[PDB]
């Protein structure tokens, strides 16, 4: 077992381990001896930030490059399923606050995620179980130069790198992903939590390419008022804000959070961090 002081378990992959010298359970992502070491380096730049998992060790053991991370809880997709694929308004708004903040933090560290979906958002454990974490930086890219903060170039005709359900419209059009896209994906995820599904979900596609084309076609045929019908106008306003962001714009994160926070206070909700799942007996 790994690092003179770690041990392995059951569960590109994750395993349940133990920091045997400090008595704590840990997640151990292994990779045949290239992408673990890279992600491992992005995590380091992200380190210390709120909602970013801590990396306790990076090395190699036999035929594997091992990365030891702090154990985290269930994914929002998982909690959503457990909740019958239905979250209350208070829960979406509580999640909406922290998620925006995680995305802004990642952007503040020069990277963009490019893979924002319910599965890449996991709740913490213990004292942190009220903390929304962001994971999987496998598709993360620096969008600006660390020192000069020179934004990457606008590029076209690219192939979709991510998950078509939550991808931004500009991503479907082939445009280079930037900060705005991470936020547009979050917006679709918030409506996903609100409706239980997205209108461009489960579209029939014989091939895995007429699908991306059916989604794209559908996602651009569905105006935001129709997608958000029956919900607080805040969700529509948010999506519209995101669709208006210029490729190199610094998103006004505060305005987005205050958008939801006002809908929050208006509903009488309080930030006590009691999620729907926290009430399942």
From Swiss-Prot:
Q: Which GO annotations describe the biological process of this protein?
A: circadian regulation of gene expression; COPII vesicle coating; endocytosis; Golgi organization; microtubule nucleation; midbrain dopaminergic neuron differentiation; non-motile cilium assembly; positive regulation of canonical Wnt signaling pathway
Instruction: Provide the GO MF annotations for this entry.
Output: ATP binding; cadherin binding; protein kinase activity; protein serine kinase activity; protein serine/threonine kinase activity; tau-protein kinase activity
Where are the catalytic residues?
A: 115
Maturation and modification: Autophosphorylated on serine and threonine residues; this autophosphorylation represses activity. Reactivated by phosphatase-mediated dephosphorylation. May be dephosphorylated by PP1.
Question: Reaction catalysed?
Answer: L-seryl-[protein] + ATP = O-phospho-L-seryl-[protein] + ADP + H(+); L-threonyl-[protein] + ATP = O-phospho-L-threonyl-[protein] + ADP + H(+); L-seryl-[tau protein] + ATP = O-phospho-L-seryl-[tau protein] + ADP + H(+); L-threonyl-[tau protein] + ATP = O-phospho-L-threonyl-[tau protein] + ADP + H(+)
Q: Which keywords annotate this record?
A: ATP-binding, Biological rhythms, Cell membrane, Cytoplasm, Cytoskeleton, Disease variant, Golgi apparatus, Kinase, Membrane, Methylation, Nucleotide-binding, Nucleus, Phosphoprotein, Serine/threonine-protein kinase, Transferase, Wnt signaling pathway
Positions bound to ATP: 29
One term under GO cellular component: spindle microtubule
Where is each Protein kinase domain found? 6-264
Q: What is its main location?
A: cytoplasm
Q: What is its EC number?
A: 2.7.11.1, 2.7.11.26
Compartment list: Cytoplasm; Nucleus; Cytoplasm, Cytoskeleton, Microtubule organizing center, Centrosome; Cytoplasm, Perinuclear region
Activity regulation field: Exhibits substrate-dependent heparin activation. Drug-mediated inhibition leads to a delay of the oscillations with the magnitude of this effect dependent upon the timing of drug administration. Inhibited by phosphorylation. Repressed by 3-[(2,4,6-trimethoxyphenyl)methylidenyl]-indolin-2-one (IC261), N-(2-aminoethyl)-5-chloroisoquinoline-8-sulfonamide (CKI-7), 4-[4-(2,3-dihydro-benzo[1,4]dioxin-6-yl)-5-pyridin-2-yl-1H-imidazol-2-yl]benzamide (D4476), 3,4-diaryl-isoxazoles and -imidazoles, and 4-(3-cyclohexyl-5-(4-fluoro-phenyl)-3H-imidazol-4-yl) pyrimidin-2-ylamine (PF670462, PF670).
Q: In which tissues is it expressed?
A: Expressed in all tissues examined, including brain, heart, lung, liver, pancreas, kidney, placenta and skeletal muscle. However, kinase activity is not uniform, with highest kinase activity in splenocytes. In blood, highly expressed in hemopoietic cells and mature granulocytes. Also found in monocytes and lymphocytes.
Signal sequence segment: none
Into which EC class is this enzyme placed?
A: transferase
Quaternary structure and interacting proteins, as annotated: Monomer. Component of the circadian core oscillator, which includes the CRY proteins, CLOCK, or NPAS2, ARTNL/BMAL1 or ARTNL2/BMAL2, CSNK1D and/or CSNK1E, TIMELESS and the PER proteins. Interacts with DNMT1 and MAP1A. Interacts directly with PER1 and PER2 which may lead to their degradation. Interacts with MAPT/TAU. Interacts with SNAPIN. Interacts with DBNDD2. Interacts with AKAP9/AKAP450; this interaction promotes centrosomal subcellular location. Binds to tubulins in mitotic cells upon DNA damage. Interacts with GJA1.
The entry's other comment says: May be involved in Alzheimer disease by phosphorylating MAPT/TAU.
Q: What does this protein do?
A: Essential serine/threonine-protein kinase that regulates diverse cellular growth and survival processes including Wnt signaling, DNA repair and circadian rhythms. It can phosphorylate a large number of proteins. Casein kinases are operationally defined by their preferential utilization of acidic proteins such as caseins as substrates. Phosphorylates connexin-43/GJA1, MAP1A, SNAPIN, MAPT/TAU, TOP2A, DCK, HIF1A, EIF6, p53/TP53, DVL2, DVL3, ESR1, AIB1/NCOA3, DNMT1, PKD2, YAP1, PER1 and PER2. Central component of the circadian clock.
Family assignment from sequence similarity: Belongs to the protein kinase superfamily. CK1 Ser/Thr protein kinase family. Casein kinase I subfamily.
Disease as annotated in the protein's UniProt record:
Advanced sleep phase syndrome, familial, 2: An autosomal dominant disorder characterized by very early sleep onset and offset. Individuals are 'morning larks' with a 4 hours advance of the sleep, temperature and melatonin rhythms.
The protein in question is named: Casein kinase I isoform delta
Q: Which species?
A: Homo sapiens (Human)
Name the gene behind this protein.
CSNK1D
């Amino acid at each position: 077992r790994v690092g003179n002081r770690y041990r392995l378990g059951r569960k590109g992959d994750i395993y349940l381990g133990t920091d045997i010298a400090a008595g704590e359970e840990v997640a151990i992502k292994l990779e045949c001896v290239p992408q673990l070491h890279i992600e491992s380096k992005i995590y380091k730049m992200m380190q210390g930030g709120v909602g970013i998992p801590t990396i306790r060790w990076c090395g190699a053991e036999g035929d594997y490059n091992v990365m030891v991370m702090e154990l985290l809880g269930p994914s929002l997709e998982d909690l959503f399923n457990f909740c019958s694929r239905k979250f209350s308004l208070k829960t979406v708004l509580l999640l909406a606050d922290q998620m925006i903040s995680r995305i802004e933090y990642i952007h503040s560290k020069n990277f963009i995620h490019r893979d924002v979906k319910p599965d890449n958002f996991l709740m913490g454990l213990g004292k942190k179980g009220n903390l929304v974490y962001i994971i999987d930086f496998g598709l993360a890219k620096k969008y600006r130069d660390a020192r000069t903060h020179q934004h990457i170039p606008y590029r076209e005709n690219k192939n979709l790198t991510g998950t078509a359900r939550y991808a931004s419209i500009n991503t479907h059009l082939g445009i280079e992903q930037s900060r705005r896209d991470d936020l547009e994906s979050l917006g679709y995820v918030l409506m996903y939590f609100n409706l239980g599904s997205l209108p461009w979900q489960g579209l029939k596609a014989a091939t895995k390419r007429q699908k991306y084309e059916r989604i794209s076609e559908k996602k651009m045929s569905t105006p935001i008022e129709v997608l958000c019908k029956g919900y607080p106008s805040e969700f529509a306003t948010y999506l519209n804000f995101c669709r208006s962001l210029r490729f190199d714009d610094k998103p006004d994160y505060s305005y987005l959070r205050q958008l939801f926070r006002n809908l929050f206070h208006r509903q009488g909700f309080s930030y006590d961090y009691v999620f729907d799942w926290n009430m399942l007996k």
